[PDB]
Amino acid sequence: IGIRLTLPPPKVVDRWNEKRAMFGVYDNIGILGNFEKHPKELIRGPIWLRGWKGNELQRCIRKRKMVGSRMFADDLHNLNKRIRYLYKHFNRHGKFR
Amino acid sequence: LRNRVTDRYFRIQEVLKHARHFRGRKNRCYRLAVRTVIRAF
């Protein structure tokens, strides 16, 4: 029986965090910081998709050339296998050709 | 599981309440309850 008996503890959320209240601050640093920086130069994430959208296969290719020199051994092997699988899926399978 | 269905109970009970006056396993088992309440309607 998937339904639970007691209703869960209430998620108290502070909508006025230091992070929530000042979210989006220093966006539009490009148009009115007279273009010294770009808004894509403030995204803190992985080093390969830092201001680049791409695909799934495009993400795995970009990860493999930017980072794959310093990846773990099986994690690289699960990355070569996934580019080899997505190459056979996107180019050879599907509808619409 | 991200996004697994929580309210499956209320989709079963809207079918089962139209099948309580039935006979056999059709008044309880959802697989058998649907195939008779569809034919009941």
């Binding site: 998937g2 639970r4 008996l5 | 929580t6 309210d7």
Partner: peptide, 26 residues
């Protein structure tokens, strides 16, 4: 445990409905 709140709540307004049909108030 499933992640919800609304599904658990509507089960609370269904169980307390059954109480007042099993042991009704005076």
């Amino acid at each position: 445990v499933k992640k919800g709140f609304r599904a658990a709540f509507r089960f609370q307004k269904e169980l307390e409905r059954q109480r007042l049909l099993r042991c009704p108030p005076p």
